[PDB]
Design a binder for this molecule. Sequence first.
Ligand code: 6BX
Ligand code: MG
Ligand code: MG
Ligand code: MG
Ligand code: MG
Ligand code: MG
Ligand code: NA
Length: 756
Amino acid sequence: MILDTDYITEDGKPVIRIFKKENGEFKIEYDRTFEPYFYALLKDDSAIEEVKKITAERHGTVVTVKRVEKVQKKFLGRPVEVWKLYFTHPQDQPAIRDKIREHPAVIDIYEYDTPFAKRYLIDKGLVPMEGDEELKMLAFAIATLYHEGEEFAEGPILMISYADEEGARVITWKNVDLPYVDVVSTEREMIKRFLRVVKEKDPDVLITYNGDNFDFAYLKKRCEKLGINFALGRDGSEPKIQRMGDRFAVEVKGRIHFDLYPVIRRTINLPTYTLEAVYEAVFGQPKEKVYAEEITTAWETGENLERVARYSMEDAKVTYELGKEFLPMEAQLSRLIGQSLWDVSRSSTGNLVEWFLLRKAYERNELAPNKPDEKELARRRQKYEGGYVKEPERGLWENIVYLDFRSLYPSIIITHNVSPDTLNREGCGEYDVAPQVGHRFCKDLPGFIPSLLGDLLEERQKIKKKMKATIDPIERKLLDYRQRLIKILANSVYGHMGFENARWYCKECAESVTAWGREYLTMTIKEIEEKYGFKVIYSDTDGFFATIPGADAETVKKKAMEFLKYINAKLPGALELEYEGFYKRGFFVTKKKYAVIDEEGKITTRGLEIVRRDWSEIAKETQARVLEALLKDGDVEKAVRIVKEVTEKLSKYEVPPEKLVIHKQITRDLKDYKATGPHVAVAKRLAARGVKIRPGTVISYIVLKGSGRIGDRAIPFDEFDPTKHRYDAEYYIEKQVLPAVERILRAFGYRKEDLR
DNA sequence: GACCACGGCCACA
DNA sequence: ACTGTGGCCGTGGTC
Ligand SMILES: O=S(=O)(O)C[C@@H](O)CN1CCOCC1
Ligand SMILES: [Mg+2]
Ligand SMILES: [Mg+2]
Ligand SMILES: [Mg+2]
Ligand SMILES: [Mg+2]
Ligand SMILES: [Mg+2]
Ligand code: NA
């Protein structure tokens, strides 16, 4: 199984290294054949000789074009001839390229900014994480001495915890009687022992939580102060750093550094992304927190160091189990995109589709379009219409059913050959014309995007079939991971066509797909009402909820099935509508907000404040309880009863303060904010106090009893003393709980005053 | 100073 | 920064 690729220079020539794991043995394949290149388009093939005589400078050594090759490729589905410019070293082409681009006889250069090892994986048709080879894993965490006002890593590393299949153990340079504690003399011996543990375990993946921005940087700073060689790589190298926009990420050559923070932030949405919070969310069991204050005090007084070690052991044991749950899926994503698990676990979704598309484009001899320049980016600042959300039939409905279009947008793209290369193509014999936008799509030849999406969705159906037949639960889940990810990728390819930074950006294709989908949904609505007698309560973009006014439950189900068959025949191509489920009752507040209950009793809430992270748990809990009473038993009397009980508890200040915390995120440099609301105000004060509030910082504030601007009255919950503070129950009643439960109970006549 | 437009944050598809 | 559609609220601007 391929794990990663990179390249090392040797006598000036590049050498690709393929880190594999075959038959349970770590192997390194060396290739000295691959040559760096990019494509260039000339007004006249004549100037190729003048293009051969181009110069530049790197490391005091002039860089020249090695050779040229005339290659014929298809750009935008159209034939074109292009010169392939070869170079001696990969780093030569980050130079020269701007010089070539500015040459008079060149039009543009293509596939220039492509990583050499990535280009190898693509051009060689190599797929990471392919095989039944199980991987050895090891999760490590650190515990450091923190003193305020000091620089980074001024204090020492107190403990180094690691966890694997055998268990969790902590290495520390002080005496603790905990059985999982190995005691050493100095921080140097602690680090040294950790490297020995890694070296002897030869781990394939190293699981860290936020290790890309802390654990490895702290370990590096200490290994430089104490004069250690942090040779954690299988090639005998130290963890290398690579920039990732504002922040950085660390690689362990010959291994895969799996930082769980970016993966978990992307996959799950929670109010706060603390390790303890992530654990109790994914596994249901709480994890105790020991703050740096307690840690430093315990180390300096030598008292209660056992508890600090327990935190370290857990911090690692949970990191392993979390990684064990999130690695197989991310490995299958790596298999799908054709890039290393390291890169896919840290890259944005819009960048993953670029890797996938560039692989496919190489498979189809399609010259990959470049990225948008600044002027075209502004030219791409255009807006098009999207889905059709109907003003919901607000209130409570009974015996209802949701019908959805399976992969609506992808089905449209394939059915009508929707793609930038099949748009207004002069000289075709078959054209499908897009509603409202009037864009003509050639169907004589299948398009790039439709071909990819077609092959993809074909695989997903195949994958689901093998899954339902597969007997190993592991293998099954692997297949289940692929089918879900295939669906995400397909719909993401549509977003690429609308992404300004995307290389295959066709606004026409986007608005055409939206228009088609609007049409298909509208007709379905008209037919299910006029021809079959239903009332559409709500519809967003790819489906709708509906029922027959005063209908028997089983009647709705049966009559619903009939409309599916009727509409599917009238539905062109693979555009199908399907029966997601039946719900006894459901409340619809407004667009993008509702909740329904299955016949078993499971409630699905969407958009309602119960799912929001920027809302007090007391409001979310209360709104949920109201929703349960109504959607389960209709005890509206109990619902208002619950509201009154909660409001009285808040009046008497008997509600746990943790349920009154509002979690909001800083999305930019506080310097550039233009509306200092409560959360950015709290952080701005924290900023002056010393704390660095950066993009992504989650602020957790509470409102203390007082008056005036909400901002100049909120404190971070880490600064809340129940003995010295009192929360503004009025705010948490007249601005949190009531303004949410009212929106639901307004349908039944109750007003805020009627709720105490 | 009462009312309202509105950054700004998050959610659904 | 997938995109688009959408609902909120604390805050200040505005007569
Ligand atoms: O049945 S509900 O839960 O009311 C609505 C969902 O089925 C809608 N889907 C669309 C596809 O992505 C997941 C959500
Ligand atoms: Mg390029
Ligand atoms: Mg190519
Ligand atoms: Mg047209
Ligand atoms: Mg195409
Ligand atoms: Mg059909
Ligand atoms: Na792209």
